[PDB]
Scaffold this active site. Structure first.
Site, PDB file in Angstrom:
ATOM      1  N   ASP A 244       2.021 -87.654  96.655  1.00 48.54           N
ATOM      2  CA  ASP A 244       1.581 -88.932  97.211  1.00 48.54           C
ATOM      3  C   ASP A 244       2.366 -89.187  98.507  1.00 48.54           C
ATOM      4  O   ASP A 244       3.596 -89.302  98.492  1.00 48.54           O
ATOM      5  CB  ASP A 244       1.802 -90.067  96.211  1.00 48.54           C
TER       6      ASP A 244
ATOM      7  N   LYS B 287      -2.947 -83.126  96.188  1.00 44.48           N
ATOM      8  CA  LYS B 287      -2.716 -84.066  95.089  1.00 44.48           C
ATOM      9  C   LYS B 287      -1.415 -83.748  94.359  1.00 44.48           C
ATOM     10  O   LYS B 287      -1.012 -82.596  94.291  1.00 44.48           O
ATOM     11  CB  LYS B 287      -3.894 -84.000  94.097  1.00 44.48           C
TER      12      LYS B 287
ATOM     13  N   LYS C   1       1.170 -77.003  94.923  1.00 44.76           N
ATOM     14  CA  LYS C   1       1.593 -76.814  96.306  1.00 44.76           C
ATOM     15  C   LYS C   1       2.842 -75.944  96.409  1.00 44.76           C
ATOM     16  O   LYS C   1       2.875 -74.949  97.133  1.00 44.76           O
ATOM     17  CB  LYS C   1       1.865 -78.174  96.960  1.00 44.76           C
TER      18      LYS C   1
ATOM     19  N   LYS D   4      12.906 -84.008  95.097  1.00 43.28           N
ATOM     20  CA  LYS D   4      13.401 -83.141  94.015  1.00 43.28           C
ATOM     21  C   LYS D   4      13.860 -81.743  94.485  1.00 43.28           C
ATOM     22  O   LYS D   4      14.461 -80.999  93.719  1.00 43.28           O
ATOM     23  CB  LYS D   4      12.393 -83.017  92.866  1.00 43.28           C
TER      24      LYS D   4
HETATM   25  N1  LIG Z   1      -2.763 -70.739  89.677  1.00 42.99           N
HETATM   26  C1  LIG Z   1      -2.081 -71.321  88.668  1.00 42.99           C
HETATM   27  N2  LIG Z   1      -2.327 -71.018  87.375  1.00 42.99           N
HETATM   28  C2  LIG Z   1      -1.645 -71.586  86.367  1.00 42.99           C
HETATM   29  N3  LIG Z   1      -0.673 -72.506  86.557  1.00 42.99           N
HETATM   30  C3  LIG Z   1      -0.327 -72.893  87.798  1.00 42.99           C
HETATM   31  C4  LIG Z   1      -1.027 -72.311  88.949  1.00 42.99           C
HETATM   32  N4  LIG Z   1      -0.496 -72.873  90.053  1.00 42.99           N
HETATM   33  C5  LIG Z   1       0.461 -73.746  89.643  1.00 42.99           C
HETATM   34  N5  LIG Z   1       0.552 -73.757  88.295  1.00 42.99           N
HETATM   35  C6  LIG Z   1       1.496 -74.556  87.492  1.00 42.99           C
HETATM   36  O1  LIG Z   1       1.286 -75.947  87.641  1.00 42.99           O
HETATM   37  C7  LIG Z   1       2.536 -76.602  87.855  1.00 42.99           C
HETATM   38  C8  LIG Z   1       2.585 -77.279  89.233  1.00 42.99           C
HETATM   39  O2  LIG Z   1       2.919 -76.389  90.311  1.00 42.99           O
HETATM   40  P1  LIG Z   1       3.709 -76.969  91.592  1.00 42.99           P
HETATM   41  O3  LIG Z   1       5.027 -77.532  91.131  1.00 42.99           O
HETATM   42  O4  LIG Z   1       3.733 -75.915  92.678  1.00 42.99           O
HETATM   43  O5  LIG Z   1       2.760 -78.236  91.936  1.00 42.99           O
HETATM   44  P2  LIG Z   1       3.028 -79.379  93.068  1.00 42.99           P
HETATM   45  O6  LIG Z   1       4.020 -78.865  94.039  1.00 42.99           O
HETATM   46  O7  LIG Z   1       1.627 -79.750  93.739  1.00 42.99           O
HETATM   47  C9  LIG Z   1       3.654 -80.838  92.198  1.00 42.99           C
HETATM   48  P3  LIG Z   1       4.315 -82.100  93.337  1.00 42.99           P
HETATM   49  O8  LIG Z   1       3.245 -82.762  94.105  1.00 42.99           O
HETATM   50  O9  LIG Z   1       5.109 -83.169  92.449  1.00 42.99           O
HETATM   51  O10 LIG Z   1       5.318 -81.362  94.357  1.00 42.99           O
HETATM   52  C10 LIG Z   1       3.614 -75.555  87.735  1.00 42.99           C
HETATM   53  O11 LIG Z   1       4.087 -75.536  86.388  1.00 42.99           O
HETATM   54  C11 LIG Z   1       2.879 -74.269  88.026  1.00 42.99           C
HETATM   55  O12 LIG Z   1       3.485 -73.140  87.389  1.00 42.99           O
HETATM   56 MG   LIG Z   2       5.920 -79.766  95.058  1.00 46.94          MG
END
Ligand SMILES: Nc1ncnc2c1ncn2[C@@H]1O[C@H](COP(=O)(O)OP(=O)(O)CP(=O)(O)O)[C@@H](O)[C@H]1O
Ligand SMILES: [Mg+2]
Ligand code: ICS
Ligand code: CLF
Ligand code: CLF
Ligand SMILES: [Fe+2]
Ligand SMILES: [Fe+2]
EC number: 1.18.6.1
Lengths: 476, 522, 262, 522
Positions: free
Chosen positions: C129, C10, C15, C41
């Site tokens: 997504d 999600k 991730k 990004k």
């Molecule tokens: N185990 C955990 N405990 C606390 N915060 C966490 C965490 N894992 C991730 N986060 C925080 O949540 C946010 C999202 O992390 P990340 O950017 O890796 O998500 P993502 O890659 O799924 C978003 P996208 O789908 O847009 O790429 C970041 O600020 C991260 O520091």
């Molecule tokens: Mg990401």
């Protein structure tokens, strides 16, 4: 025969998987001239079955290749990768008078030639830059159209914005056209998107202007693309009849003729399929009536001249009867020379959206019979007009497949086929005389009295050629 | 009006006084046309050095390009295999265009299908179209093989050809052993020659990737020949003739010569001849693989060097004397066959022709364009003749190719005034032939528009077009010609020296003005 | 020899964070790893490389003219632990086509032989997504063979794991690509680990590890580092090592069975 | 003046103002030249019907003939035999001309001797020259065979070649067994084709006349082929290639293709290839004898039917589709070999080209001339193409041939506007193209002056020259072309249709006047 043809239909359809069979069955019919609702006997304007070698093109061909491309003093940008614009460069013979590259641009290929970076980052910046270079290198251009190819519509480039912004900065009409090739099912939707764009971006420029001097004899030719000079050969008849042709859409067409079309008294619509859209709109917005005419062969032309002249005073009717009397000895001699050579011959046709019914008249004037006909992309209102023009128990096909057309001809065995460049060489190899009915085999015009002479000569030269008796080696 | 005894078509019909008068009225009344005065001044300006500078500052606009897109090449590639149907996954507009394009060049039927992806297949993907389409095609046109490529829209959305085909098979739309090789052919990358490279590589990988285990190089004693994007029937035929003549066992991979030249005998043949599936399967067993047009067979070469392990020779396209020689020695070296007396004599007959015509070809200046290998082969031959290439344009060329061609040019006194252009189109070339006028142009039919333009400036500035390349739409049956080998070189030499003599006679045909040099003997 | 893995889940689930922290531990274990970022990004390697890795693939191609002119040397850099990093790049929000950018970059890496050094693992970090074919480029044949789906106990995260699993099936049936497991990145919901185990069971997979919510992760992120590099002794740092050890030892690769919401 | 960087040859140098002025002064001051007014008036008069009536009343004056004399054909015949030296007994002026004429058409060395008969040999006879000449020729140039023909003067004074040669042998100037066939070839009878008929009959008589006792017809299972006067290298080759393709054993009698196309490899080969003396001795053992050009191989035909007893088939020259067919079936009936699939397909490809080009060929009007068999072959093909021959001229033709051709013309709708002319020259034909203008001329180089004339009248009256025939001196390497069989017909089809398209483009190249019909696709 009616039952025999029905049987031919069911046998041909036996090769297809069931999905394709149930569908192709809806697009093949045995004609009844009595029927006036074609929906009951056939359906058209649906999507092609995948992998069956349809002869249909795309929306872009319909818009750029057909409606926009002929307009000679605009520059038409093939917006996207380099293929589309290159396969259509000077392929369609929409004749024009002009100094190419200076004040006229019809045979030229303008493109943004997308590379991979333009796909991924989008091409609005390149498009803007492209319009600046155009205005530098072709300063006598009187407007620009942007013809979107497939990927412009996928990625969501904002060509309307670039057209409003750049057009203002330069005080130039720039017409954005979303004629993405995956839109629709064929050329047809491209006509429509092309007509709506004419409407939205050009047709209204002179709504407030009243400087143009108008007469009760003003008409426009709508839906003639001047193939081999067809429109020039039509135009001369209308004017000898005392009418004044302010516009021609869009063969040999100028952007100023299009803007002046709202000032006419009557719209003369030759190709119904491709421009009935703007014709209904001009009747709704400006009060201009429109009427369909046929200038293929003497009978249809004579009938059309009388019908059109009847929309005006008796002076124009008098001139109608004059034009007729003038060309009477010319089309009668053509008949006396060529009909004895063509009498009784059977022809099968397959063309786009107008000619499959429109040219039947000319063939009959030489004593030929149309035994089969069909369209690449007509709608049911075209087939409404078609069925009374065909004889009973004739075959009708829509978006016919290479296979279907091949097998129909094997059984029906016509003397002549009139179709397109993709069909041509298949049937010559079969020993069947063949005439191109889009390009006129680089001949023509075929419209009007002068064209009929070239029409008679072409049908006879080909059908009666000495090459057709040579296909079998004497020894086998 | 028409005189029934002498009917006039559009030319010269519209030169009759009544049509001319009518067109004069059209223009004056409704066209709102720029004054002739201005048109002539604008025209003159576009022939200048200043317009050229602007023209060569272009960064975004392309005008009259000299290339087409990838799937056109794929289709041509696929056509070269036995009972094979080219199948283009994506929009059907493309296929209508590819067929028309080849119809006009070859004056032959051209068989190819689409799977008619519409707007909903744009947003949902073409998985269904690929299922129904492969099934419908196999059933209706009954190919032995279906060779799948893509339009630009299927490429934007990332339609996974491999997966779509495997699910088609898994779900029973086509049998699992039914061969369906594929290649992603994005139109917004490279050009039509790149599409040929990509398609060939898909098919070769399809037939040889799994089963490299039991292959031994050299075990079938034959030499693989990969021609590349080629549109002179004579070119396939001459390679085959020279190998047979030497006694070399060979295998031509992608061979469309038969299917593009079927006889008119009362029947239509959708398929004819071509490279068999067994030949492809057996290819890795060949002595070696020779690429005829290496500058657009780079992807093929990596697979063949990497997977088949062939020491693919570094050979230029076999055009002209040196490179035909070089081709023949290397085929001789790989196979063990000496060069027969018959080829050696042919070589000396081309030399004899060069000696006979050298005084008329010498110092003659040419502008030319076409595909990368064709152009460099044609450039090399023009230099061997004592000619001076002046403008060398290759729109689909790259920086490395340009470097090689600049080296050939600099190795000869005859290349001192030549410049190579990559990325430039026929509108650029048009400026060059006005500002630095050569004697002739060598290119495809699109060059007739340049010739018309140069003539409008004046008969002394007219640069005649010599039609060699692809596509040629306004002459008949030039596709039966040859450009490779000694045979190709003889034909080109004859086309060139006689264009030179045809033009000279035109300039000397004026009674009591130029005809003192209208010689019977040249 | 070489294992290729693709990380899905999600939008906003963690991730890129989870992926990078895992790889850090993996490298610290002595593995040779490449990370391939598949997000316009281009943040997927931002914690393995401190501060910058300026050069995305699409960026360099746009500047260099075409992807074909671009050499492998220009876009592939090494960060913490010798971990190799490359970014697809793509347009800014709202213009162009990020999907095609991924196709092009992955195709570039293949054509240039980026996979054949002496690599143990390749990781593709994909955005949330998955709107088009371009973003399934990492799970085509001869790309990733293992997929791990990051989720949590809340309704939306699980719903997404299931929809990504349906998108996988067409690539799984016709190919060798398999689901490796679900990684639970906790949101501190009730009985959350049990809940994700249950979901994993219904899919046909396992939950490889439960990763606690610990703000050291975000604190390290603000420093442009992994927790492994920012604070090797922390409890969260040992968590990624545990997750790391399990991914090395995983043998469970299934075709998942998507459920109907009831 | 000359620019060292861009040197001008005679054209365009003399268009410089100072040369132009110097020429203006030359004319006015010293030529006493008729006023331009009168020159233009006489010119116009030479284009009219009334001049034509005068022109066609000629009885004594010949202007621009379209033929040559007998010994030229005799020399060409002899050249076709292995290591054979053509030897023309008589005046040396004749030989210097024969070689030159062939040098310029074939662009090859041409070996032939004279025995240089002077004024004293005129009055005393050429006996002595013949003794010394044979000895000198044999010793210096060492041929295997010497073939003796005659100049006009040796014919007037009745030099008995048979006697002079035997006395040469009896007196030991040349060895008695050394082959020295001869033929009387008077230039005031017939023309160069009659000379070939005479030469071939002399050689054939020489090698087979004594020894008919031990010959059996059909015993070597081969078919004899006699080409006749043929100047397209390709024509010898296509016949050899087609028979070989059928597996028909054949013997081509008089074969100069090799000696007229030697390689430029560092050495001059005075001799190469050709019909062996053994082939000639063995000829009567063949199944039958086919004459490729019957209308000038009538003397040969009587000798072979009378003496060898071959039932020589009644065959036309094999040109175009019907007569190539007819030729192939007859070779099949005689040899027993079937017509192979490769030839059947070659035929269908020519038919395919005819279907492809027919809309442009239809109704085109041609004036043409050349030798009897070539002309009729060319007329028959034009009718197969749907073209209209209008003026058919054959200067060395005869009344029976004229009848044969009028019958062919009448067998087709397309021959209704044609007239055949015998005894009439190129000054006659010139009137024909002014008074009854055809679209093109098909003829040899001598026709370029006609085109020059028609253009001087007006661009709309210009009738373009299509060069097919002999001699062709103003283009290069056309002698390598083919005019016989399916291959010949394809080359001819392609030349005609592209001459039509080339001329149409020229007529539609005018910017904003005619270029509305300057189409990309034709
Ligand atoms: N185990 C955990 N405990 C606390 N915060 C966490 C965490 N894992 C991730 N986060 C925080 O949540 C946010 C999202 O992390 P990340 O950017 O890796 O998500 P993502 O890659 O799924 C978003 P996208 O789908 O847009 O790429 C970041 O600020 C991260 O520091
Ligand atoms: Mg990401
Ligand atoms: S526009 Fe249409 S396919 Fe009406 S897209 Fe097509 S020059 Fe045809 S039957 Mo080509 S609806 Fe014109 C036509 Fe007819 S291009 Fe021409 S010949 S009268
Ligand atoms: S329906 Fe164009 S030909 Fe295609 S692969 Fe793209 S560059 Fe080549 Fe129509 S708008 Fe055009 S022609 Fe097709 S792509 Fe679409
Ligand atoms: S030395 Fe005598 S004047 Fe001189 S060129 Fe000779 S003939 Fe003439 Fe001969 S070429 Fe033929 S055979 Fe007589 S006609 Fe004439
Ligand atoms: Fe053909
Ligand atoms: Fe020579």
């Amino acid at each position: 025969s009616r039952e025999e043809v029905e049987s031919l239909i069911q046998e041909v359809l036996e090769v297809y998987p069931e999905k394709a069979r149930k569908d192709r069955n809806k697009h093949l019919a045995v004609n009844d001239p009595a029927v006036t609702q074609s929906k009951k006997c056939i359906i058209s304007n649906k999507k092609s079955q995948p992998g069956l070698m349809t002869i249909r093109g795309c929306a872009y061909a319909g818009s750029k290749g057909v409606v926009w491309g002929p307009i000679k003093d605009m520059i038409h940008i093939s917006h996207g990768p380099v293929g589309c614009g290159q396969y259509s460069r000077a392929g369609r013979r929409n004749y024009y008078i002009g100094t190419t590259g200076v004040n006229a641009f019809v045979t030229m290929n303008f493109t943004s030639d997308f590379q991979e970076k333009d796909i991924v980052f989008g091409g609005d910046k390149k498009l803007a830059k492209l319009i600046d270079e155009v205005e530098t290198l072709f300063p006598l251009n009187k407007g620009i159209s942007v013809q979107s190819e497939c990927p412009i519509g996928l990625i969501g480039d904002d060509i309307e914005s670039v057209s409003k912004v750049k057009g203002a900065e330069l005080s130039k009409t720039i017409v954005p056209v979303r004629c993405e090739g995956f839109r629709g099912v064929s050329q047809s939707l491209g006509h429509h998107i092309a007509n709506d764009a004419v409407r939205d971006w050009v047709l209204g420029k002179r709504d407030e202007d009243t400087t143009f001097a108008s007469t009760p004899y003003d008409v426009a030719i709508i839906g003639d693309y001047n193939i081999g000079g067809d429109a020039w050969s039509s135009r001369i008849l209308l004017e000898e009849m005392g009418l004044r042709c302010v516009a021609q859409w869009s063969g040999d067409g100028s952007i100023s003729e299009i803007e002046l079309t709202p000032k006419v008294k009557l719209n003369l619509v030759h190709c119904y399929r491709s421009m009935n859209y703007i014709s209904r709109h001009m009747e709704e917005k400006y009060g201009i009536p429109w009427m369909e005419y046929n200038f293929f062969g003497p009978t249809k032309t004579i009938e059309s001249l009388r019908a059109i002249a009847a929309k005006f005073d008796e002076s124009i009717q008098k001139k109608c009867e004059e034009v007729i009397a003038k060309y009477k000895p010319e089309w009668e001699a053509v008949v006396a020379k060529y009909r004895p050579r063509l009498e009784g011959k059977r022809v099968m046709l397959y063309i786009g959206g107008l000619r499959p019914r429109h040219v039947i008249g000319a063939y009959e004037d030489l004593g030929m019979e149309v035994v089969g006909t069909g369209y690449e992309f007509a709608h049911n209102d075209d087939y409404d007009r078609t069925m009374k023009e065909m004889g009973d128990s004739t075959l009708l096909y829509d978006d016919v497949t290479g296979y279907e057309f091949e097998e129909f001809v094997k059984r029906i065995k016509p003397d002549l086929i009139g179709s397109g460049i993709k069909e041509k060489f298949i049937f010559q190899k079969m020993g069947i005389p063949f005439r191109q009915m889009h390009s006129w085999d680089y001949s023509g015009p075929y419209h009007g009295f002068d064209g009929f002479a070239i029409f008679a000569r072409d049908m006879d030269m080909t059908l009666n050629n000495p090459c057709w008796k040579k296909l079998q080696a004497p020894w086998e | 009006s028409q005189q029934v005894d002498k009917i006039k078509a559009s030319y010269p019909l519209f030169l009759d006084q009544d049509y001319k008068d009518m067109l004069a009225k059209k223009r004056d009344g409704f066209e709102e046309k720029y004054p002739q005065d201005k048109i002539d001044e604008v025209f003159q300006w576009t022939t200048t050095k200043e317009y050229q500078e602007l023209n060569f500052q272009r960064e975004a606009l392309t005008v009259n390009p000299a290339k087409a897109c990838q799937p056109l090449g794929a289709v041509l590639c696929a056509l070269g295999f036995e009972k094979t149907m080219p199948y283009v996954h994506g929009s059907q507009g493309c296929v209508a265009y590819f067929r028309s394009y080849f119809n006009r060049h070859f004056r032959e039927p051209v068989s190819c299908v689409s799977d008619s992806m519409t707007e909903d297949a744009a947003v949902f993907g073409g998985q269904q179209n690929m299922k129904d389409g492969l099934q419908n095609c196999k059933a209706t046109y009954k190919p032995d093989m279906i060779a799948v490529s893509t339009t630009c829209m299927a490429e934007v959305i990332g339609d996974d050809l491999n997966a779509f085909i495997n699910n088609s098979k898994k779900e029973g739309f086509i049998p699992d052993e039914f061969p369906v090789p594929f290649a992603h052919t994005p139109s917004f990358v490279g050009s039509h020659v790149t599409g040929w490279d990509n398609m060939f590589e898909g098919i070769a990988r399809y037939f040889t990737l799994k089963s490299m285990d039991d292959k031994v190089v050299g075990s079938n004693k034959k030499i693989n020949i990969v021609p590349g994007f080629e549109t002179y029937l004579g070119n396939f035929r001459v390679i085959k003739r020279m190998l047979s003549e030497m006694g070399v066992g060979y295998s031509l991979l992608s061979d469309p010569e038969e299917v593009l030249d079927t006889p008119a005998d009362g029947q239509f043949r959708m398929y004819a001849g071509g490279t068999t599936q067994e030949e492809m399967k057996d290819a890795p067993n060949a002595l070696n693989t020779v690429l005829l047009q290496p500058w657009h067979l780079e992807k093929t070469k990596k697979f063949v060097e990497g997977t088949w392990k062939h020491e693919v020779p570094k050979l230029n396209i076999p055009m002209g004397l040196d490179w035909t020689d070089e081709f023949l020695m290397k085929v001789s070296e790989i196979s063990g066959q000496p060069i027969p007396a018959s080829l050696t004599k042919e070589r000396g007959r081309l030399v004899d022709m060069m000696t006979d015509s050298h005084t008329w070809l010498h110092g003659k200046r040419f502008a030319l364009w076409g595909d990368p290998d064709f152009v460099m082969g044609l450039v090399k031959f023009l230099l061997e003749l004592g000619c001076e290439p002046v403008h060398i344009l290759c729109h689909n060329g790259n920086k490395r190719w340009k470097k090689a061609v600049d080296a050939i040019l600099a190795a000869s006194p005859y290349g001192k005034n030549a410049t190579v252009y990559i990325g430039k189109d026929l509108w650029h070339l048009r400026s060059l032939v006005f500002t630095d006028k050569p004697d002739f142009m060598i290119g495809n039919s699109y060059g007739k528009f340049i010739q018309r333009d140069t003539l409008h400036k004046g008969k002394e500035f007219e640069v005649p077009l010599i039609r060699i390349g692809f596509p040629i739409f306004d002459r008949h049956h030039l596709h039966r010609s040859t450009t490779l080998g000694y045979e190709g070189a003889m034909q080109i030499l004859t086309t060139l020296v006689n264009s030179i003599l045809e033009r000279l006679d035109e300039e000397t045909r004026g009674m009591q003005a130029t005809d003192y040099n209208h010689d019977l003997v040249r | 020899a070489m294992r290729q893995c693709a990380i899905y889940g999600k939008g906003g689930i963690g991730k890129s964070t989870t992926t990078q922290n895992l790889v850090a531990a993996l490298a610290e274990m002595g593995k040779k790893v490449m990370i391939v970022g598949c997000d316009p990004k281009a943040d997927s390697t931002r914690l393995i490389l401190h501060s910058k890795a300026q050069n995305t693939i699409m960026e360099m191609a746009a500047e260099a003219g075409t992807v074909e002119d671009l050499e492998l040397e220009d876009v592939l850099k090494a960060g913490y632990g010798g971990v190799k990093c490359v970014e697809s790049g793509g347009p800014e929000p709202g213009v162009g086509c990020a999907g095609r950018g991924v196709i092009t970059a992955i195709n570039f890496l293949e054509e240039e032989g980026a996979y054949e050094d002496d690599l143990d693992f390749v990781f593709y970090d994909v955005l949330g997504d998955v709107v088009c074919g371009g973003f399934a480029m990492p799970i085509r044949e001869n790309k990733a063979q293992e997929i791990y789906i990051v989720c949590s106990g809340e309704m939306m995260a699980m719903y997404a794991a299931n929809n990504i699993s349906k998108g996988i099936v067409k690539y799984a049936n016709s190919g060798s690509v398999r689901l490796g497991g679900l990684i639970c990145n906790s949101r501190n919901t009730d009985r959350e680990d049990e809940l994700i185990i249950a979901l994993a069971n219904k899919l046909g997979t396992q939950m490889i590890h439960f990763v606690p919510r610990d703000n050291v992760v975000q604190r390290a992120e603000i420093r442009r580092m992994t927790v492994i590099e920012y604070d090797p002794k922390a409890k969260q740092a040992d968590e990624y090592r545990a997750l790391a050890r399990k991914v090395v030892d995983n043998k469970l690769l299934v075709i998942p069975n998507p459920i109907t919401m009831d």
